[PDB]
Design a protein around this ligand. Structure first.
Ligand SMILES: O=c1cnn([C@@H]2O[C@H](COP(=O)(O)O)[C@@H](O)[C@H]2O)c(=O)[nH]1
Ligand SMILES: O=c1cnn([C@@H]2O[C@H](COP(=O)(O)O)[C@@H](O)[C@H]2O)c(=O)[nH]1
Lengths: 220, 219
């Protein structure tokens, strides 16, 4: 019983202008039904943008807020985020189990999902995150987390994450395209890929999305 | 370093504009520095920063625990400074590139970065504590001048002060509701952050005045 992402492709909509964000999302709407919205767009245009996306596209919204505070603050962040209409929120595991549990509680209260970020995809992740990543994944399993995020840029690490969480858990993966990750290789392990700049900075975002999907058509 | 009145920073985590403004107004004679985080910002919008600047003579620290990849961190910092925040708080666990991205924007934009080195809640023991000394040392190497460390662990706060040196600026949450003591915390931190002990009080002004009275010899 997991999220069903059209074409295994999640748009990372990190444009910071409302008109551009709506236009570009509109251009690729035939290809997706899931949009990841983060702080670049929300802090520039307000949390009301989430409801607007739902009104215009009916798409699922994952709030990529990298939640990383103490439990009582995490609870408030999740509540405000779900009140705005997000279907799911992404939370860091590095701050520990109590901080993750706070998010799980609010998600269960409001009919939403928590995604646990286990290993980030950028070079700096090697310094502290990578050494904790397997343990963070096991912590997710212990807590009953069913949704995870891991790195397209390190398919061996993404594979290990998939091993830890099992085939039943849901796994999404950013770092495809601009950061160097490959769509098809990433989908060997992840249920869905997250793609931002490769699509939203493209001269023709629709063609960019279509091209990515063409490259993975055998993977559905 | 920023000159924090009474060594006391209000953590304004009420989620309703009217309540947040009322409480902040009530304690304005005691503070000139307010920490605004996502509970309030996600409820009322980034224009809440503008509103606080208009209503109060307060510096604004945006406690956004910035914790993304460098390119996204840059965007978050730009949006936050554009809205009028004096400073932003960032995490170090995502690594040096992620911190450097924030520092670069702050330098370009004439604002400040605070690095959170060790959080004050129990879960911090699992992963954060073991990385904290290195995160602090990384901050020093990167040129970070402003830091956050935990009131709830005096021994850890003392070690973090040692690492960053006496010239760095250190603020510390976990005072009051989380169990930290104002006076003991100020042995090491330049200023204490206080939220619920003030903002949930029947009389927030009396609560702030009481905390200040308890540390008067340190002012
Ligand atoms: O470990 C990571 C790496 N990137 N991202 C996010 O995924 C998107 C990647 O976008 P991109 O395709 O433009 O690189 C951005 O929103 C970035 O913050 C994560 O959530 N986790
Ligand atoms: O390690 C920590 C612990 N708490 N906080 C923040 O400081 C405030 C503590 O508020 P309190 O006095 O109500 O506990 C809240 O905004 C919390 O998110 C931090 O930034 N870092």
């Amino acid at each position: 019983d997991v999220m069903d992402v059209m074409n295994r492709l999640i748009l990372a909509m990190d444009l910071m202008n409302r008109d551009d964000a709506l236009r570009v999302t509109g251009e690729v709407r035939e290809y997706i039904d899931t949009v990841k919205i983060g702080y670049p767009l929300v802090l520039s245009e307000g949390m009301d943008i989430i409801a607007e996306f739902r009104k215009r596209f009916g798409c699922r919204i994952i709030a990529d807020f990298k939640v990383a505070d103490i439990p009582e603050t995490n609870e408030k962040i999740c509540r405000a985020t779900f009140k705005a209409g997000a279907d799911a929120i992404i939370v860091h595991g590095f701050p520990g189990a109590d901080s993750v549990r706070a998010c799980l509680n609010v998600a269960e209260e409001m009919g939403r999902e928590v995604f646990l970020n286990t290993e980030m995809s950028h070079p700096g992740a090697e310094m502290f995150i990578q050494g904790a990543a397997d343990e963070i994944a096991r912590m997710g399993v212990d807590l009953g987390v069913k949704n995870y995020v891991g790195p397209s840029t390190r398919p061996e690490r993404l594979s290990r994450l998939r091993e830890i969480i099992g085939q039943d858990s849901f796994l999404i993966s950013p770092g495809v395209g601009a950061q160097g990750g490959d769509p098809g290789e990433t989908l060997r392990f992840a249920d869905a890929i997250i793609v931002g700049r490769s699509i939203y900075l493209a001269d023709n975002p629709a063609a960019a999305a279509a091209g990515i999907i063409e490259s993975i058509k055998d993977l559905l």
